[PDB]
Design a protein around this ligand. Sequence first.
Ligand SMILES: O=S([O-])[O-]
Ligand SMILES: O=S([O-])[O-]
Ligand SMILES: O=S([O-])[O-]
Lengths: 243, 243, 243
Amino acid sequence: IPPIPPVDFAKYGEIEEVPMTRLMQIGATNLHRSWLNVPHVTQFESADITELEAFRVAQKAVAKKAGVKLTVLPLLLKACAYLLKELPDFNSSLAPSGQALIRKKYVHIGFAVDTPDGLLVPVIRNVDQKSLLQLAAEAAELAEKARSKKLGADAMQGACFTISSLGHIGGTAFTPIVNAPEVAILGVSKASMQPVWDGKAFQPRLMLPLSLSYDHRVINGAAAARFTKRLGDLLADIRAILL
Amino acid sequence: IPPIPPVDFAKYGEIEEVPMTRLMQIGATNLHRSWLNVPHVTQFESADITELEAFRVAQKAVAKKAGVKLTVLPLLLKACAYLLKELPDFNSSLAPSGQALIRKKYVHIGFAVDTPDGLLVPVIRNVDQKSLLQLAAEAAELAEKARSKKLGADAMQGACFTISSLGHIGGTAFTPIVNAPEVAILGVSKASMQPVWDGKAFQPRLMLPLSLSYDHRVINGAAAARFTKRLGDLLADIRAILL
Amino acid sequence: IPPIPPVDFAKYGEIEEVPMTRLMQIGATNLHRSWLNVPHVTQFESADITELEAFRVAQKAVAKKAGVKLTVLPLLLKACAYLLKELPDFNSSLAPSGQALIRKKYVHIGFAVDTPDGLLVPVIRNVDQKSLLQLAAEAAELAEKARSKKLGADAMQGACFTISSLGHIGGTAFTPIVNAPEVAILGVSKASMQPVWDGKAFQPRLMLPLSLSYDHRVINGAAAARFTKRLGDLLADIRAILL
Ligand SMILES: O=S([O-])[O-]
Ligand SMILES: O=S([O-])[O-]
Ligand SMILES: O=S([O-])[O-]
């Protein structure tokens, strides 16, 4: 890999050198390792979350009683956990030989937290076994631990899949990097009101932008487009998780 | 290229190792070879296909008589073949020295077929010479051969360009990988009804999402944006292929 | 990096070998160097530029008197220069050790010009110090020099950030390559009239598609989504640059 030539940046004006934290350096190295090893594709999709939002908001007091805040992340975690079991190849890693897949029979999912010192991705174990309020409690606990530098490296291991949600900040879509040896990552951006054709007129529906990057060595185009379509369906009516 | 560290995945739960087919392994290797050799950009565009869809549907019985099904692929194949001749740099490969281009004077186009054993990309030769019903017949024949493992490696050689259509499954857009030594690939996702401003009001138009990835060593930004704009124009009125 | 196997392209029909200019070859090499060194993410956003367009058009005669044409580029240059000072990490380069950042205290911005011989990126120095008509005059001068092969390599050095605008040609969005050692590049595509929910109904607003690619070793997801959100805000009301 050819290196970037050094440039005397001070020839063009004043510069200031500030050091990178160790977390930023670990991160830089893992990202660059994933980038070069994984042939990335991003598949974009929009999910209609009008009803899902109404549910979330109508459970505000039950969430309050439980002392948890209920955001879209536990809902995304539950729906993805259901799909990782339905489409097992997303729940796998490429074996070090490059000639077999290791299918994981558990579902643990990490979620990205951007903290001032760098990115951490805490893992929730057995997501397919926890309820929405359990996941909400857990996600908040791990996020606060991540911010407080109090998270154990123990809790950043064993993920099958990652969710990276920027919806609280903005954006229409992005192309996340797969956290190798995982095979896929779901980016979530900001939901907005969009006109959706019902067959006769455009209705306003609250649409959530989804961006799935995947390792194309393990997942082909039709599989990935089937995963985001199924995820948009489950999010459009999450009672389907019950059958 | 730093390798991904091996992880004992069984520390986190139960695992199952399943082998990769040879096709999946050939594919993994070509994809990773393209990924590292081609600096990729994807240019997105939406084509108004309202009239083109009306045409397709009104020729359903002539297609039936010919025993072919007429989908959007032959139409995409014809329009791309016309543009590969109009903008010759898309119809070329970089010479092994990296200092000349080999401009191809023929137009053969491959199209991706995802089969249970892996991805195959059959090639149709001299697309610019065949009619819409010839291409429809041919594309279906090659697709069935690809599924039946009966396709000759003969028929997976010599493409100038590739079309990867996921529209039958879903999605809004994706970022396909260039099938090197080709210089560009057209991803096609699902068409949907969108409000398009006519100058005074939004009309419902059926819009087809197009995603062109190209090798930026050979094609610059303005060339690629000109190719997708011209493709959206031809698809908005394909009678322009006649002049 | 595995090489692409040579193919006898003439087995499939007639070929023509044409040479690459030196500029195309320099470019191919820098692009491929950036591609392999920078783990790229693209963050997409749409900015409401209805009022900004009305301003641009209402100043047509003052621009004329100044002999400059006022396009959206000087406006983009000023708004980005304001944000590079507000969010200093975008105005930096990774030190050759990979363990510190060099924060630049100046703001020079390059912009891509696609000329028949290849891509050039002229640099405007101290963008944060020039007015909209100064930048308009300068951008046009440098663009004409770039086309006339008369631009000095002097004038292609020292950029902190690059803007690549394809809006004059077309497209909905694209994924530009970071011009390393820079850490981010803003792609701009074609503005179009879109229905935007005001809380009660969809109004037609002129929306500008923005595509920010960044080096994820230096910039994380939340920072990049905050940069495009803030840029969409400044473009929605550029009087905010005054406070
Ligand atoms: O398998 S994808 O390349 O359609
Ligand atoms: O040639 S592109 O980088 O505008
Ligand atoms: O820092 S990004 O991966 O959310």
